[PDB]
């Protein structure tokens, strides 16, 4: 592993913190985890990041927040293994895919965790239908619209992980490809470290 | 073929047009009325937002993604630094500009007459507050013109056209910055 002197301020149930921990583990970067309670933020986080958000990555004098900015920083600073492709069109398609995952699926997931009972049930059914709907994606490629594991999977895997633990179970048409993808990502060394 | 679906008054369209002009790339501007979106935009981009860029087979939206794509596809002149640390700092600047300054700018164009005059005073206040930043380097927190200036310049341009004038302390660094970015060939093309 790499002996960095980084501190990650994070919360263990936050999906954005989860994305960043997977990238840190992929890159083999050692860092200190500083757990934070969202209602009771530590003053040292406030000192470094006045917006008081997590994840916040601190490396010596550098302070970063926003998980997309953090992840691209780590991929650029620590090239191996590559979590984005090399060529500009692939990079743009992956970026657009990420934005859409975040925009379209993440709020439904949040509703599924934090809504009223009919909202939850309604959010879960909606996410379930949508994920089943994109099943054909895998008949071509083992990672999400990619041949190799990358940042897009760092958006999809935390979401599937949360759905699994909310009781979602995939059956019917498209469920074989989704279960296969889950095994492929959940069993990776980095994912194992991220939920450790 | 290269097409930008764009609205002429939209700040995010303006960002992308500056980057297109810097890279010297030819494109067709498809003007869109926000209240009546054309069908050919809807079929390429189900979300119906602008700017939307179409490059041969690739469809892109969201101005940040378009700009990064252009900077990577058309490498010179480079609009981002080379070091991962500097690139991250600039990304974070841009995020903060867009999150903290842009809503106040929208309010200054879209509000009631009370809302508008209030927003204009706030923005003018915060910009004069950071006068010593404009003082530091010729471009915004950078020695060379880059993507960060593509966030700052369109905002100052809108303000100029909303009647804002800078006088008093630090207004000198801000005016000198405006003169310097507004008179670049790429910027003059982007407003043409």
Curated annotation (Swiss-Prot), chain A:
Q: Which N-terminal residues, if any, form the signal peptide?
A: none
> Which Pfam families does this entry report, sorted A to Z?
GST_C, GST_N
Family as reported in the entry's similarity comment: Belongs to the GST superfamily. HSP26 family.
Question: What biological function has been recorded for the protein in this entry?
Answer: Forms an equimolar complex with the RNA polymerase holoenzyme (RNAP) but not with the core enzyme.
Would you tell me the Gene Ontology cellular component terms? Answer: cytoplasm
Where do the GST N-terminal domain residues begin and end? 7-82
Question: Which top-rank group of organisms is this from?
Answer: Bacteria
- Domain GST C-terminal stretches: 87-196
Q: Which Gene3D superfamilies match?
A: 1.20.1050.10, Glutaredoxin
What is the protein named? Stringent starvation protein A homolog
Q: Which cysteines are joined by disulfide bonds?
A: none
Residue ranges of the TM segments: none
**Organism lineage:** Bacteria, Pseudomonadati, Pseudomonadota, Gammaproteobacteria, Pasteurellales
């Amino acid at each position: 592993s790499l002996r960095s002197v980084m501190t990650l301020f994070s919360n263990k149930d936050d999906i954005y913190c989860h994305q960043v921990k997977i990238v840190l583990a992929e890159k083999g970067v050692l860092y200190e985890n500083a757990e934070v309670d969202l209602q009771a933020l530590p003053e040292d986080l406030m000192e470094l990041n006045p917006y008081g958000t997590v994840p916040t990555l601190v490396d010596r004098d550098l302070v970063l927040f926003n998980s997309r900015i953090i992840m691209e920083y780590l991929d650029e600073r620590f090239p191996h293994p590559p979590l984005m492709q090399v060529y500009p069109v692939s990079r743009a398609k992956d970026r657009l895919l990420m934005l859409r995952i975040e925009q379209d699926w993440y709020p439904t997931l949040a509703k599924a965790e934090n809504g009223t009972e009919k909202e939850k049930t309604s959010a879960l059914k909606q996410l379930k239908e949508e994920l089943l709907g994109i099943a054909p994606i895998f008949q071509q490629m083992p990672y999400f619209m990619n041949e190799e594991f990358g940042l897009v999977d760092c958006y999809v895997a935390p979401l599937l992980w949360k759905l699994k633990h909310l009781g979602v179970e995939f059956t019917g048409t498209g469920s074989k490809a989704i279960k296969a993808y889950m095994e492929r990502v959940f069993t990776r060394d980095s994912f194992l470290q991220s939920v450790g």
